[PDB]
């Protein structure tokens, strides 16, 4: 179902609506594109523009609040646009960070219309969209050099999300009505280089599963069982993948690992009966 040459500039992200019927591509050309996919067809609708620097990542909001797609660019700003009347418009612009923003994912509709922003400005922001338009932002420093990922943890307070460091550190953050904002929990060390990406699973089974990919060219699957329980570092393999590792994605169900390399190859992984990993 290829959509050959969607952009002019190299593409940095390919995400779909909750109903895999409409896509969203973003590139360096500072532009994002909306799509329609059927059997093998690709209808190109609008092309989102207002981004000064290369767009990095984008994320589809839950249909619960209509059609909304958020994008983050080098321009140190993340922007969201809705699709009222089949015509794409820019609803709000979030630019609190001072430097590139490399990741932006939406919170489980349960939580609400929340967006988690992680900038290379070393900080991270949490923003929910009220009514009138003016939101109440929440920012908290998260890493030394910077921040590269900010995946969320499923619903359960009890609001958690993992961060990937520019300083090689993976962290866990849980809300706190007494602290007024998300505070640190874990600080799982493991990578020798920078944490390129970290995604948290929705697999509600007995134990929690977290993925961490990095310039150190390895994935460390962080498995923990309960509050007490510490996270068990686990090398996806006791060798190095020839190139870096940029993305890690969790399948809806069946909990399978989508590990987008850098050697330009995508690999899939599963945890056999023991607790190790194998292809698919």
Residue numbers in the entry: 2 to 157, 169 to 292
Sentences from the paper on this structure:
In eukaryotic cells, newly synthesized proteins are transported from the endoplasmic reticulum (ER) to the Golgi apparatus through the action of the coat protein complex II (COPII). Sar1 recruits heterodimers of Sec23 and Sec24 to the membrane, thereby forming the inner layer of the COPII coat. Sec23/24 is an adaptor complex: Sec24 binds transport cargo while Sec23 interacts with Sar1 and recruits Sec13/31. Sec13/31 heterotetramers constitute the outer coat layer, thought to polymerise into cages that enclose the budding membrane.
We incubated giant unilamellar vesicles (GUVs) with yeast COPII proteins (Sec12, Sar1, Sec23/24, Sec13/31) in the presence of a non-hydrolysable GTP analogue GMP-PNP. To understand the architecture of the Sec13/31 outer coat we applied reference free, contrast-transfer function (CTF) corrected, subtomogram averaging to solve the 3D structure of the vertex, and of the connecting rods to resolutions of ∼40 Å (and ‘Materials and methods’). The connecting rods are consistent in shape and size with Sec13/31 heterotetramers, and are bent in the middle by approximately 15°. This same bend is seen in the solved X-ray crystal structure, which can be fitted into the densities as a rigid body. In contrast, there is a 45° bend in the rods of in vitro-assembled protein cages. When we analysed the distribution of vertices and rods on the tubular membranes we found that they assembled regions of rhomboidal lattice.
